[PDB]
């Protein structure tokens, strides 16, 4: 949620502007939980999962402030509880 100058000229009108992410519904498989989840994601999430070599690594490695998802934090607790027990 921000503002922009029309035609990128500070002397022109200042307009409200919202940039929204492109959302995709994709299916992921968790090895630790042995379950498939249909989750709305962005292309960034897919890239981050690729760099982590899987959903389980992404969920476990990513700190709370980077996941930015209550569902993601719930998956982390589920995975961690299975590993702990």
């Amino acid at each position: 949620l921000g503002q922009i100058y029309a035609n990128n000229d500070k002397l022109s009108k200042r307009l409200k502007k919202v940039w929204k992410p492109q959302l995709f519904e994709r299916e992921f498989y968790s090895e630790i939980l042995d379950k498939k989840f249909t989750v709305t994601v962005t292309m960034r999430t897919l890239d981050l999962i690729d760099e982590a070599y899987g959903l389980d690594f992404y969920i476990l490695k990513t700190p709370k402030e980077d996941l930015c998802s209550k569902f993601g934090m719930d998956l982390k607790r589920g995975m961690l509880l299975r590993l702990a027990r």
Binding site: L1, I4, W19, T42, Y53
Partner: protein, 202 residues
């Protein structure tokens, strides 16, 4: 991802303090939208065989759509992580020297599948007396079927062929798979004549 930057400078806050943001610092300019960037490929290690690439343990660079929507979900491929690379590398050593048997390369599987379902038209000229030998027959794979066959691999029926007829050529692909293709010896027709005669006519 949209990447933006502020039009107006934000004053330094210092160590251990939060920046003082005025309402002018909400004015942004679009630096870049990363969805328009040139797409990069995804490096995966194959598990099963696929038409494009099929050697188990082959490091393949695929389109991110292909890897994410097909290979990885179905188990046909795995991530090229350091741990996975080590495991597949170890298996390669065993295949080369150990009990584990050697397997066709990516191209070898493609040829074998084509050689299983193909018939060779070995056009031979009527005027000149001709004897069919591996070298001559090898040439016709290149011209007719488009396969580049090494002369030594071919195994002919071992009966001298000087008459138009039907025989069998046993092709060995890379030394592991032996395919027997139907062989149709026919009177040679030049490319232009054969295409005009039949392809154009019908």
């Amino acid at each position: 991802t949209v990447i933006v930057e502020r039009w107006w400078k934000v004053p330094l806050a210092g160590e251990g303090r939060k920046p003082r943001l005025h309402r002018r610092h909400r004015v942004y300019k679009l630096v870049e939208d990363t969805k328009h960037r040139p797409k990069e490929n995804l490096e995966l290690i194959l598990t099963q065989s696929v038409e494009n690439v099929g050697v188990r343990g082959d490091l393949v660079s695929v389109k991110k759509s292909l890897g994410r929507n097909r290979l990885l979900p179905q188990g046909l491929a795995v991530y090229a992580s350091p741990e996975n690379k080590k495991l597949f590398e170890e298996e390669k050593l065993l295949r080369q020297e150990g009990k584990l048997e050697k397997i066709q390369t990516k191209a070898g599987e493609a040829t074998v599948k084509f050689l299983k379902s193909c018939r060779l038209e070995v056009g031979m000229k009527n005027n000149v007396k001709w004897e069919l030998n591996p070298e001559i027959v090898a040439r016709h794979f290149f011209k007719n079927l488009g396969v580049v066959v090494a002369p030594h691999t071919l195994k002919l029926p071992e009966e001298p062929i000087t008459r138009w007829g039907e025989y069998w050529c046993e092709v060995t692909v890379n030394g592991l798979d032996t395919v027997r293709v139907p062989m149709s010896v026919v009177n040679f027709e030049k490319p232009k004549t054969k295409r005009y005669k039949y392809w154009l006519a019908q």
